Amino acid sequence: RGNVFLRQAEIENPLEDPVTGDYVHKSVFIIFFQGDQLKNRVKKICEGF
Amino acid sequence: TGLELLYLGIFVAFWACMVVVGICYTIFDLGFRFDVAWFLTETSPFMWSNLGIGLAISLSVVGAAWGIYITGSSIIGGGVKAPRIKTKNLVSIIFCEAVAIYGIIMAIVISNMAEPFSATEPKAIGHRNYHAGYSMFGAGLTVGLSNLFCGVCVGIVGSGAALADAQNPSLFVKILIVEIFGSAIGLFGVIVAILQTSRVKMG
Amino acid sequence: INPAPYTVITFPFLFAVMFGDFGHGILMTLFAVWMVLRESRILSQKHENEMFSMVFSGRYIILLMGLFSIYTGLIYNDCFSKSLNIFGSSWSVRPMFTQGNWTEETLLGSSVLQLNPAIPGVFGGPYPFGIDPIWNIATNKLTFLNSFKMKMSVILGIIHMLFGVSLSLFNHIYFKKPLNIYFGFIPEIIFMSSLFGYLVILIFYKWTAYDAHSSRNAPSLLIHFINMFLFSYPESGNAMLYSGQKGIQCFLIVVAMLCVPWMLLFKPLILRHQYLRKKFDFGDTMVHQAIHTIEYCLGCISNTASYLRLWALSLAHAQLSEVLWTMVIHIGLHVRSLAGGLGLFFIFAAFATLTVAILLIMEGLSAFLHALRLHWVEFQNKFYTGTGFKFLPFSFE
Amino acid sequence: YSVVFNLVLWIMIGLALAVIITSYNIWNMDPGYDSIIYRMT
Amino acid sequence: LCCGPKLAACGIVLSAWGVIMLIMLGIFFNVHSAVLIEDVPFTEKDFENGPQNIYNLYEQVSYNCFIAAGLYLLLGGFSFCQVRLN
Amino acid sequence: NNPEYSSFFGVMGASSAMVFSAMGAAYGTAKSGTGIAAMSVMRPELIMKSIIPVVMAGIIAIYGLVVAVLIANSLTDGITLYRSFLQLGAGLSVGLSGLAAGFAIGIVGDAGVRGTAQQPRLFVGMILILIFAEVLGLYGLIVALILSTK
Amino acid sequence: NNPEYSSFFGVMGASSAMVFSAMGAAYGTAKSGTGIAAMSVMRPELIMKSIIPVVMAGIIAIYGLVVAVLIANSLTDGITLYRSFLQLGAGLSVGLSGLAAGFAIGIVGDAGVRGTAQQPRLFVGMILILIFAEVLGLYGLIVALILSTK
Amino acid sequence: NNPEYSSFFGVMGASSAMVFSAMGAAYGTAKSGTGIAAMSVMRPELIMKSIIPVVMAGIIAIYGLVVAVLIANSLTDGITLYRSFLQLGAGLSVGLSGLAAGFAIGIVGDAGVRGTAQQPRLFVGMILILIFAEVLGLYGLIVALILSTK
Amino acid sequence: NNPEYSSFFGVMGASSAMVFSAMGAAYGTAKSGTGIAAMSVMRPELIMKSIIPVVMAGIIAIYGLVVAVLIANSLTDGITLYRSFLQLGAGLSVGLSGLAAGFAIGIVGDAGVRGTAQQPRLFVGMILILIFAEVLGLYGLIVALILSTK
Amino acid sequence: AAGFAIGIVGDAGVRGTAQQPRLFVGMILILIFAEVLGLYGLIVALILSTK
Amino acid sequence: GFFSPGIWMGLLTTLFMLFIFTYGLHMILSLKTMDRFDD
Amino acid sequence: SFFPELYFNVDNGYLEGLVRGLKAGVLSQADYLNLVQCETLEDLKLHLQSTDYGNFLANEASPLTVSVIDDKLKEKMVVEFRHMRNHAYEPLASFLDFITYSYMIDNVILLITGTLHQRSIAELVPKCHPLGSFEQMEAVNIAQTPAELYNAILVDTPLAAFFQDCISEQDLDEMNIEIIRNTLYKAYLESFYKFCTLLGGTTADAMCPILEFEADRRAFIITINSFGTELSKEDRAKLFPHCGRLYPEGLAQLARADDYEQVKNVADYYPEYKLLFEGAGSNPGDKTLEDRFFEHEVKLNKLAFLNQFHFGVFYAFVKLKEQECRNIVWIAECIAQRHRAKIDNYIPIF
């Protein structure tokens, strides 16, 4: 609900897939929170991602 | 649909204008300015002839294309799991082009009898040229429309037969009966277009 | 009846009728020579171009196709859309034309066309080989070319079909099928003959009969054929082509009518009689016989009409070649004393690329496939059952 | 006058049809239905 | 090396075709003296006096064919040289 | 003398007579063929029977001929306006009657093929309905004759 | 002296009496046909009792035919244009009334034939609605005759 | 004798003769392009073969030009109405035939391009049907030519 | 003797060439643009490698503008109606051909820009497909140059 | 045309201002041009009444 | 002049062309594409 | 001169040809007759190699078990469906998305019941159908109140279009999940019926009876199975669909039922369900009612295929294909256990 903040960073070289071997792209993110219940909610979301 | 609404609006406006104009003119005792004789005597016979000539090939080609696509799409799609149907089901395409062949032959036949004249007023041209122009226009129109509807029906049944043949080999050889019965109406159209202009002596 | 021995030649012939040009034929035969002579190295070589593999499959196809293309380029007197005046013209002689009140007109010649007539006394005459070159420059060439090409196409198509049915007669006689010869081949060949061999013979009669002075009221064959179909005899409007046409024409109509019922009732009934003698769905046999007879009778007109593809594509090819000549290299010739060859080098390079791209490989493909279709349907279905198995040997890879 | 009537009539019909079509299309317009629109409450 | 053989073979056949066709067209102009059937193109808006101007102009036109042939032959030689770069 | 535009009306009538008949016959034949093709997968033994609808549609095409020929034979250079009106009326009547009958046969056949595919006892019933559609077309023919040879 | 072109209108009247009415009767069978496609697949025994809408459509066609024949028969050369307009009005009247009757008959027959599959008593209701749905054509025919004979 | 309205019809014929063919070829190329985009991802190796439908559509353009200059090589100030309408008829014929051929080429090209991606053997068959599509243009050209001389 | 209204028709050519021309250059320059956005998110490297369709659309706009400016430069007040017809025909041909070319380049670009992101090879194919549409535009120009000189 | 533009941009700005107040400024700037689409027109019409 | 002698012919021809151009435009406008992409 | 006859093929001919080609790949009755004669799973594998279901098990499955066959068959199904969807145009894409929303609802309900069984978190992933998967499928675990579920689902899954307003609560439990299921299902069915009747033509004719029967079957099931619940009769009235022919019945007779005989009396006035119930003896020695429901569904789906311009033959195809998958896996399971009690209880499709 917009009470938290986030920032993103990008990588160029593709990272290999250990199981199949296909190349896929990724990105890095950093979130600043204000509570632990939100940490658990975004932990569930990040388990989804 | 916006396009259908546009067409309906144009059509309704046109017919409302026609109705209102007709009623006020008839009530206004102005029937002497509606002289259809001038309308159908100023027009040159060659315009009627050439419109007929154009249509007699144009509409046939339109029907041929319609049937070509309608059967070809199904023929190509349905053969992925049965390549055997590529060559067995080529009769429909052959008929879809035979329609255009008939159209071209009719265009050649009617294209004759185009000797100019020198008269420039209705009293000098005479009845014969008027008859020639009207008859040629009518023949072109009828052959074109007949071959159009013929080609559409041929294409539809060709698609049906081609699609059904991929299930069992012993189907197509008997489902082609409707396919052959399709072409008879186009043949009739050609015959009538022949007969309508069998007594024109323009020149 | 194996159709390869005849097809191997009648296929490039029909192609060459569809593709009758000299230079393009020479290019095709040169490609054929290249591909034939280098066969050993290319065969022992890996190539990524599958198109080239299927091109290479048809070696002698392309060779014979190019040979007959060269021939038919020579016979039309077509060579890159221009005739080759080899051993003389016989049409235009202006010094002789001055006899027939032909002088001073060319002052108005700057804005008129001044038709040339036939036979002011020494004109006409047959060129011993091909089309007279003057026709290539005549502005009304299209009329005579259309007439000649349409007639040649129709005549070629009728003999192809009679060939088909006569070949079928061999197919049936070997298999010991007296019924098929007696109530099969005979009515169909008689129908084909009576309906179109008459047209062939009439075309040749008109060719060898009417001279130039009879240009007034020259009879028209197409209207006579419409009256052949519609049985209409107006008292006037078209003079008889030859005396006594009425009786022969009427008998032709009556035999054409009498052809159809012979193929419908007699042979299913004889099959029924044989089955009765044995002691067979009769209605299904009647349905099959009606299907066969109607198919043949309508395919008659449909195939004779579809043989016009020869004329159509030949005329289109001639028009396309002339169009290329008209607005690609025509600009290349001009008055510039120095820049002629320089610009013409670029222009002819472009001409070569464009005539390779369009008429060489493509119109050749269209004619190739059209002739293949004419072989598959109009020719093959009259003697070729088109059913059975194909060998599957036990050989490994 | 019999020519000016036709000329003005056809020009007027064309211009009227054009404005009608364009305004009609600009009315039935898809804003996108993004997180601003679809979302409510 | 430069102008690899892959296109140089096509270039060589093109140059041979150009040389042959241009030479033959020029010879057809000169030998037949530009018969109107085989030679429509020209540049003269006034010829009513006699044919000598027409013949001279058509010879002038046909002259350029051999220059074109020479350029095509030089192109073919250049392509052949590039083929030898192996 | 007569006006010079008399033959135009008869010409248009003769054209329309075959145009409309052809459109109706085409629609009926197309729908009957589609029905037969759809049905053929499940009941291969009924293929002959379901051809009865399509041939029915074909008959309407023939009706068109019986009008369009008859006008073209009776047309000449200087006919009067009365006969031209008569021929136009006959042609339009038969053409549109044939069109409507064609639509009727098409719909009825498309349904009846399915009915006989799923239920044999249906078949003969639907045959009756098809005849009724044909009746309408024939009525058109009658009117045209009374408006043609008169 | 009555003009000659006046006859044209009269001829067109006959055309309507066989065109418009016919189209109505087309619907009057066609929809009913697809209704049967849903009825007899589970309840075939009632097929013989389900022909009534088709007979009503045939009756509409009969009305159209009788009025068209009557209009065409009375036609002559020397007509006052008032007679021609009277005939045109009668023909248009009967044609459009028959169109309405055919539409109503078709829809009612379709609804009733689909509905009878779960009510054995729907027969009387279908008949008693159908009488009203068909009386329209009779009224149009009555007035068409009273106009034409006058 | 001939009014100033004459060359109107010939000029419009010349314009339309090419405009319609251009539109048809454009639609064919568009449909084939989207079909190629769909086909590409799984089977790249066929790309240089699947150009065959596209070039085919392009043919139509050239055909229009064969007439679009030709009629333009005969127009002059002193031309009668007869020749003008002859030019008009030729132009309409070629233009509409080109339009129809373009539609057909586009559709069958898309279908075959999609088909070959999962069955290479289909390739041959595709080209065969496409031949017919090209012929649709060819006939439309031919008549136009013989309408420019007579 | 020349009618006053004659110049009108030529003036409309001065509009028409441009009027449809820009429309084609609004069909493509927009649509292909969306394509180059759809994968600037993921593979921004190919942003400038498939912008060709937009440049071509600009080129068809130039094709229209050339004929427009020549049309305007060949203007007068006592123009004979024949030259007026020629001028309007040239304008119409160029305008409509340009509209079609713009359509084709636009849709093909919107497809190919998306196709290139799944495999690189498709790029080569599109350098042909797009150019084929461009050929149509060039063709229009040629006919205009015959209608402004003969 | 100007009325239409104001209507659509007003819908956009109205539903966008519910999220964050900083969309108050930018949208109104758009609105200025969306009204100028009308203003221009008035000017020329006055000239057509001046003569 | 009711309308004129000639513009009747002109209008007939131009309307006839207009119908065909509308045929062309209906199918040129209502072409369709694909969504997303095959893997 | 109507929609399906003259421009159906331009955007659908190839895909319809492919679907009708793949229809023949469905196993036939003789295939069942010979497949029920296997001795071990390897024989089943081989007899599938001999037919169109061959060359999909080339893995190193030495310890072959029926779960592997189930997984591979489902994988084949999703592959063919994704193929059919990706090559489609836009109205057909709307149709196929409308189809897949059902499995998406199924996955949503599965994860909602999984949240109650907190002990399992990741294991739910292999249990969910990949056909009904979407971008935010696994996020459903986050919610603990139905308003939070609407917040999660409003985001980018169009499933919210069926319950954005239709759910009003703030106390998720294990009893209201059935209410969520029924509300979502009835909303989806109503939207699908409305869209199908908006499309018009033969598509409406083909898809109206099927959804009608689907709504009526849901009504019958919910009426029978609602016994012994905290819900009141008015709430049972609230959940009935209005797309069937039971629209007056939904409040008139079913909404006041008290026993099974009353439901039978409701069914008695419609032959289609009356024969279905009479044939469903529900005895230990006879098939249950669910079996007759499945058989009637199969029969109607098989009927649905026969239509040349069927814009929605994909519904029948996917339902039949799921049913073949179920038949095959069930027969394999019976064979693996070395018993022949219920081998001859397979519904005979094609």
Author numbering:
A (entry chain a): 192 to 240
B (entry chain b): 3 to 204, 206
C (entry chain a): 389 to 667, 712 to 829
D (entry chain p): 601 to 641
E (entry chain f): 5 to 90
F (entry chain o), G (entry chain n), H (entry chain g), I (entry chain h): 6 to 155
J (entry chain j): 105 to 155
K (entry chain c): 413 to 451
What do the authors report?
The synaptic vesicle V-ATPase is an ATP-dependent proton pump that establishes the proton gradient across the synaptic vesicle, which in turn drives the uptake of neurotransmitters. V-ATPases consist of an integral membrane V0 domain (also referred to as Vo) that functions as the proton pump and a cytosolic V1 domain (also referred to as V1) that catalyses ATP hydrolysis. The V1 domain comprises three pairs of subunits responsible for ATP binding and hydrolysis, and its activity is coupled to the rotation of a central stalk in the V0 domain, mediating the translocation of protons across the membrane.
To further confirm the identity of the binding partner, we used synaptophysin-knockout (Syp−/−) mice, and purified the Syp−/− ISVs following the same protocol as for wild-type mice. The absence of an interaction probably arises owing to primary sequence differences between synaptophysin and synaptoporin at and near the V-ATPase–synaptophysin interface, suggesting the specificity of this interaction. At the current resolution, we do not observe substantial differences in maps and models between the V-ATPases in wild-type and Syp−/− ISVs. For Syp−/− ISVs, there is a 2.1-fold increase in the average copy number of intact V-ATPase assemblies and a 1.7-fold increase in the average copy number of V0-only assemblies.
